[PDB]
Design a protein around this ligand. Structure first.
Ligand code: HEO
Ligand SMILES: CCCCCCCC/C=C/CCCCCCCC(=O)OC[C@H](COP(=O)(O)OCCN)OC(=O)CCCCCCC/C=C/CCCCCCCC
Ligand SMILES: CCCCCCCC/C=C\CCCCCCCC(=O)O[C@H](COC(=O)CCCCCCC/C=C/CCCCCCCC)COP(=O)(O)OCCN
Ligand code: HEM
Ligand SMILES: [Cu+2]
Lengths: 96, 261, 183, 657
């Protein structure tokens, strides 16, 4: 597994350097910088999942990608419900 | 379920719509829950272990016919209840301007430490554990807390809102009938929580509310300056009704800005 | 044998839930700067960058350690584990150094809600990395004493999941708390 | 440096009588252990890595803490009955506010979670044909973390206080500025340890169900209590970490002076309610799903009929598992949120009622055309259907935001959650006790006192919380202790009478536990398969062997044991018994928990030196236990022959095969 870790080494470096460069040096309107750092972070997370964690469909008869998919769904539900609720809450708590 | 209770037979339009919603939701689930209990007892008696003439048929698991109605009838009742819920949640929400042809009276509420403070900015009055509003006149509550979360709640008028420090919550109420309505904090706040009771004297007319304001303007003490507020915000469990002649022009905002900063 | 790896994987899913809760708390409290730092003026992005490929290199050297564990060599696994522990200790030291230049100043976790949530999220990631460093040290001691025989290579495969999950959490961390705070 | 502990525990009050009673009972139990079995308790219990004994100890802790929780609840009912239309009661506001908080915390985390976890621990490894849980030492450690939580919430009674904020400790009142006492520290440091233990329990059982199944038992061939436990463990894994965070986020609020939830310097208190209920409702379904499995098994067993809707009853459980994370805002509808979020979460709450209703109707149709024998467990099942249907109906009445705006924290909410919690979890945890008592302990509970306990419980509950629905409709709010109202007196006195009836029910249950143990020999389960029995837990002996299986049966069908009873191949002398490795009992769970008790009590009271050596006591033992290499022992085939032949001696004595 030397190749896959080194494949996930140059990819990890090149997807953890361009976000820092885009943010520190600007060179892009805020909306493109945010979208690109978020995309590069989702892709680097997937690269670390597939290359480093050795994620695969079969695993021990599923239940690893399935468990990870369920955990991602619950994380998304919890985060988007703790932002959407609190955005609607904090909006309705103002002098306005 | 008391017939002459506060939830049943409310004295507010936002409470009457709330009771209608409660009754129709309770009715919608009777046609499901009541069959459930009735079959729970009927199957137990009819089949039993000694009722040997019953159709004792084991190993009968799957029934596409039975499971179909079992899934569908709650689905239909919940779809209808969900349409009703959406309508009544966008209709009976607090901060809804209550769609009336009268000018809402703004009553800035501040749930202090085991007492309620009310500030009528337009009238200049300030009261402790007592409000008053004309009959069939909208009342607009800027409910905030001073120490800990509370819940402004007039059960007969319907609907409650949460009082949080640094946060202004909007609560529109209205009293369709004149009279005195009990008020309470519905969120536990401390040892004096059982004493956070106020009265809501829904005056018969605007003239009786002007009489109530004029009586409050005869209070020798006045709500001038924020330093008085800290004196009133001192922890005390059971506070008698106290009136204040005039208030600082923006006292409720300065209560919120103690925390919001 | 393989049940322990699966159990640790679902514990890592539980830690994913924990870190998601911390991320939501930060994302809501990020604007709660009570007349203090706004985050943009204190995050010092280059200091994060040297941190972020100081924990990125750590995952790669632990990967080397794991692929050596697939082989029978023990010296290679101990050397790569020591390198991983050095990189993790450097990361934790940089975390403390950043904190020691925030708590000494009037910039501590009690300064504001935003600083409290940033300190909680990053300190919880740092406490997970420190738990990983203690676990890596204990595992190195076990490997030296007993070798990659059994229930020691299982611990290698659970600490690999732990360390790589930690680096993924730090990917999310530098993406969200850092970086986005400073534009 | 004793730091904040000092001399004042509770001397000027009459909780020192309760403390002295507890000390006397502890001394009596210590003496009874002293003469008789004292190392046995250490060597077979208290160190066990066996799922059956850990489950029994979980259930014993649940009963022992149910006595204290119900003592708190009878004091609450007496205080509320006295205060209404009368003078002040025996509980001042200070003390009473520790009574509802401790009642809710003890009943939820130490009476319901341990009871459900004990039932799952005892049954699931048996049902899935597994010799033990996947992580036999993460089970004893988790039990002892539940025990350290119990010890902290009981020490709170004598030393210090146990929080005057509510059973969830809402942020501004539970903050260090408004609750400077150690009560919220007791709450935090008991709940966090209990949550760690419960998260480890959930991990253990999730791996056990997914990986330790018998060969041939697929996902849709498992018993329905196993599916329900799998769903509750999914929820435990995906929800208790939230409880770990927010409580910890409260801890830093009270210890480091942070501002996560303080309303002063940018903190948002509304975040704590969002997180605590995003954990809370998933924990509610964690409590209710295993007893749904318990009632599915009891109905299928005591109706002598196959479970009606297995596929529907498994997919409804899975839908409840996945839909319980989108509902939580229905706990703070009155927070002031917009109509859109309130309507969305109310609709989600009403959509999470279709699966439960489907499960109820599946159980009803399981009774349909069946030989319903009215055992105590079946009576509990019928009472559960009757009460839980009402409790859920009132639950969906509070699920419409337009009605929760006016019924949020009334006694109608108290009646909803008490109706569902009792007629659900409590009925399921007593029906499991009656149903699986032969399968853990060789005797059977006395059916005469079991029926009396059920009738007392059902009648008392229906006259202790039906009045609370009327009180909620009358405008009474939750935690009223002093000067309630004259109007509330009649219904509060009826509720007090109902609480007395529930006390008589608990006493009848205690008498059943005594009259059965006294008659442990004048009844018995020689076969190992009493009351028919369709799942793969009744194929063993009534006190099942420590390995609990010598063949790991093939199953290859849904019911499994009912199939092999039907087609004869039920009781077959297997023949060659291979050596099977069983985990070795380790006491490292006790010390790690004990330092936790040292860590918790030294964190509640600010003895940092003892907390440093308490937290470092947990770690070093964890390190030392890692070094341990003797973690399993092979049981000799001679003992497997001796036990299995003994079991078949009784199978043969009766009908046999
Ligand atoms: C484990 C116990 C348990 C269970 C199973 C439930 C189940 C439910 N609960 Fe409850 N709850 C429980 C325990 C609690 N609840 C709470 C709080 C709570 C609140 C808080 C509101 C507020 O805070 O102001 C709401 C709205 C509900 C609603 C519901 C609903 C809709 C269900 C549904 O899942 C019930 C589903 C069952 C039904 C519906 C009956 C069977 C169905 C049939 C017969 C047919 C179905 C079809 C239709 C109904 C159309 N609950 C609280 C905390 C109170 C507090 O301190 O704030 C607790 C402890
Ligand atoms: C005085 C010390 C002060 C330290 C301060 C900094 C915090 C340090 C925290 C350290 C926590 C413990 C780290 C792990 C030590 C033990 C490692 C270990 O045992 O490894 C092997 C172990 C068991 O392997 P088996 O083969 O099953 O063993 C069989 C025999 N029992 O492997 C495992 O799978 C265990 C994995 C452990 C993961 C630990 C994760 C810790 C997470 C911490 C979260 C913190 C959250 C933030 C709040 C912190 C408190 C304010
Ligand atoms: C300071 C803040 C408050 C918290 C204080 C307490 C902190 C945590 C203390 C330690 C708790 C965890 C102890 C774990 C003990 C070992 C677990 C273990 O290895 O169990 C094995 C299984 O191996 C595993 O690794 C289990 C599966 C994977 C579990 C991974 C998570 C373990 C717990 C990590 C810590 C969780 C809490 C961290 C802190 C959270 C925030 C407070 C059991 O199976 P056997 O075959 O019997 O093993 C041989 C026994 N001689
Ligand atoms: C069966 C006997 C029980 C009785 C008589 C009883 C009675 C009560 C009473 C009187 C209250 C206070 C109501 C109020 O003033 O707001 C209460 C609160 C509560 N009970 Fe129970 N209860 C019982 C069992 C249980 C069980 C089994 C659970 C859950 C496992 C439970 C959980 C709670 C909770 C969570 C609260 C609210 C705590 C709080 O507000 O902080 N109770 N109970
Ligand atoms: Cu809920």
């Amino acid at each position: 597994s030397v190749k896959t870790y080194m494949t996930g080494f140059i990819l990890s470096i090149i997807l953890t350097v361009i976000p820092f460069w885009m943010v520190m040096t600007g060179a892009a309107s805020p909306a493109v910088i945010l979208g690109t750092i978020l995309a590069m972070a989702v892709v680097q997370v997937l690269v670390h999942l597939v290359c480093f964690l050795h994620m695969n469909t079969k695993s021990d008869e599923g239940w690893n990608m399935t468990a990870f998919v369920f955990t991602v769904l619950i994380i998304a539900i919890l985060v988007v419900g703790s932002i959407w609720i609190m955005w609607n809450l904090n909006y309705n708590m103002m002098m306005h | 379920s008391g017939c002459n209770s506060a939830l049943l037979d409310p004295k507010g339009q936002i409470g009457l719509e709330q009771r209608s919603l409660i009754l129709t939701a309770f009715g919608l689930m009777l046609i499901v829950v009541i069959p459930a209990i009735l079959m729970a007892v009927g199957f137990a008696w009819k089949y039993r272990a000694s009722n040997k003439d019953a159709k004792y048929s084991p190993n009968w698991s799957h029934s596409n016919k039975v499971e179909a109605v079992v899934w569908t009838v709650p689905i239909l009742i919940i779809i209808f209840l969900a349409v009703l819920t959406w309508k009544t949640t966008h209709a009976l929400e607090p901060s809804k301007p209550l769609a009336h042809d009268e000018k809402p009276i703004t009553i800035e509420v501040v749930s202090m430490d085991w007492k309620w403070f009310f500030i009528y900015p337009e009238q200049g009055i300030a009261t402790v554990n007592e409000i008053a509003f004309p009959a069939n006149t909208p009342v607009y509550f800027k409910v905030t807390s001073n120490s800990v979360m509370n819940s402004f709640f007039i059960p007969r008028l319907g609907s409650q809102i949460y009082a949080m420090a640094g946060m202004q919550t909007r609560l529109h109420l209205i009293a369709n009938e004149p009279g005195t309505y009990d008020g309470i904090s519905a969120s536990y706040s401390g040892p004096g929580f059982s004493g956070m009771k106020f009265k809501a004297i829904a005056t018969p007319d605007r003239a009786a509310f002007d009489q109530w304001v004029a009586k409050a303007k005869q209070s020798p003490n006045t709500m001038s300056d924020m330093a008085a507020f800290e004196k009133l915000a001192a922890p005390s469990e059971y506070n008698q009704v106290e009136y204040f002649s005039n208030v600082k022009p923006d006292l409720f905002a300065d209560v919120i800005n103690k925390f919001m900063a | 044998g393989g049940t322990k790896i699966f159990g640790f994987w679902i514990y890592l899913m539980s830690d994913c839930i924990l870190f998601s809760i911390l991320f939501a708390t930060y994302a809501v409290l990020v604007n709660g700067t009570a007349g203090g730092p706004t985050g943009k003026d204190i995050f010092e992005l280059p200091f994060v960058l040297v941190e972020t490929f100081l924990l990125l290199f750590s995952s790669i050297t632990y990967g080397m350690a794991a692929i050596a564990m697939y082989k029978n060599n023990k010296s290679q696994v101990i050397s790569w584990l020591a390198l991983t522990w050095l990189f993790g200790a450097g990361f934790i030291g940089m975390e403390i150094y950043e904190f020691h230049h925030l708590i000494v100043n009037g910039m501590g976790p009690d300064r504001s809600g935003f600083l409290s949530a940033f300190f909680a999220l990053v300190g919880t990631h740092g406490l997970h990395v420190t738990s990983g460093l203690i676990w890596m040290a204990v595992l190195m001691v076990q490997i030296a004493r007993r070798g990659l025989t059994s229930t020691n290579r299982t611990r290698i495969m659970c600490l690999s999941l732990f360390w790589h999950f930690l680096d993924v959490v730090w990917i999310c961390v530098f993406t969200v708390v850092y970086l986005m705070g400073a534009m | 440096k004793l730091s904040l502990d000092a001399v004042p525990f509770h001397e000027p009050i009459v909780m020192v009588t309760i403390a002295g009673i507890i000390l006397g009972g502890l001394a009596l139990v210590g003496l009874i252990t002293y003469f008789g079995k004292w190392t046995y308790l250490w060597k077979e219990w208290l160190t066990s890595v066996d799922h059956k004994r850990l489950g029994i100890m979980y259930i014993i802790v649940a009963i022992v803490m149910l006595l204290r929780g119900f003592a708190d609840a009878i004091m609450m009912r007496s205080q509320q009955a006295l205060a209404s239309a009368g003078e002040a009661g025996f509980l001042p506001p200070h003390h009473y506010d520790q009574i509802f908080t401790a009642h809710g915390v003890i009943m939820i985390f130490f009476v319901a979670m341990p009871f459900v976890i004990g039932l799952m621990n005892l049954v699931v490894p048996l049902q899935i044909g597994a010799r033990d849980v996947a992580f036999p030492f993460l089970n004893n450690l988790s039990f002892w973390f539940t025990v350290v939580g119990v010890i902290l919430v009981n020490v709170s009674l004598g030393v210090g206080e146990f929080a005057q904020t509510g059973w969830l400790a809402y942020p501004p009142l539970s903050g260090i500025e408004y609750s400077p006492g150690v009560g919220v520290d007791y709450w935090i440091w008991s709940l966090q340890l209990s949550g760690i233990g419960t998260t480890l329990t959930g991990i253990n059982f999730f791996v056990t169900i997914l990986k330790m199944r018998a060969p041939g038992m697929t996902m849709f061939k498992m018993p329905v209590f196993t599916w329900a436990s799998l769903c509750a463990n999914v929820l435990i894994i995906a929800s208790f970490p939230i409880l770990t965070v927010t409580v910890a986020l409260l801890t830093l609020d009270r210890y480091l002076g942070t501002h996560f939830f303080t309303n002063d310097m940018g903190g948002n208190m509304m975040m704590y309610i969002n997180l605590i209920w995003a954990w809370g409702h998933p924990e509610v379904y964690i409590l209710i799903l295993p007893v749904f499995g318990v009632f599915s098994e009891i109905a299928a067993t005591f109706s002598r009929k196959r479970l009606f809707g297995y596929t529907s009853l498994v997919w409804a459980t899975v839908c409840i598992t996945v839909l319980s994370f989108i509902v939580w805002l229905h706990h703070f509808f009155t927070m002031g949120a917009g109509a859109n979020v309130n309507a969305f979460f109310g609709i989600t709450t009403m959509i999470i009622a279709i699966p439960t209703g489907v499960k109820i109707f599946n159980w009803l149709f399981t009774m349909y055309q069946g030989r319903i024998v009215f055992h105590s467990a079946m009576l509990w099942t019928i009472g559960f259907i009757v009460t839980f249907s009402v409790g859920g109906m009132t639950g969906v009445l509070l699920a419409v935001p337009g009605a929760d705006f006016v019924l949020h924290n009334s006694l109608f909410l108290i009646a909803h959650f008490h109706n569902v919690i009792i007629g659900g979890v409590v009925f399921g945890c007593f029906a499991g006790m009656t149903y699986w008592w032969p399968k853990a302990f060789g005797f059977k509970l006395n059916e005469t006192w079991g029926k009396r306990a059920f009738w007392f419980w059902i009648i008392g509950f229906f006259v202790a919380f039906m009045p609370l629905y009327a009180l909620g409709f009358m405008g009474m709010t939750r935690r009223l202790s002093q000067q309630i109202d004259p109007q509330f007196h009649t219904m509060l006195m009826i509720a007090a009478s109902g609480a007395v009836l529930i006390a008589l029910g608990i006493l009848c249950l205690v008498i059943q536990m005594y009259v059965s143990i006294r008659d442990r020999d004048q009844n018995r389960d020689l076969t190992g398969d009493p009351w028919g029995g369709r799942t793969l837990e009744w194929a063993t002996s009534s006190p099942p062997p420590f390995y609990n299986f010598a063949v790991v049966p093939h199953v290859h069908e849904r019911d499994a044991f009912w199939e092999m009873k039907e087609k004869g191949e039920a009781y077959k002398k297997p023949d060659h018994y291979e050596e099977i490795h069983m985990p070795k009992n380790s006491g490292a769970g006790i010390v790690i928990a004990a330092f936790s008790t040292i860590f918790g009590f030294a964190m509640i009271w600010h003895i940092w030196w003892l907390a440093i050596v308490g937290f470092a006591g947990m770690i070093i033992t964890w390190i030392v236990k890692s070094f341990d290499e003797d973690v399993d022992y092979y049981v000799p085939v001679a003992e497997i022959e001796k036990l299995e032949n003994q079991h078949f001696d009784e199978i043969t004595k009766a009908g046999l095969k």
